Predict the structure.
Amino acid sequence: XRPPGASGXR
């Protein structure tokens, strides 16, 4: 998916 924790700074 896009794990919040870091999907890069976004």
Summary: DSSP finds no helices and no strands in the chain.
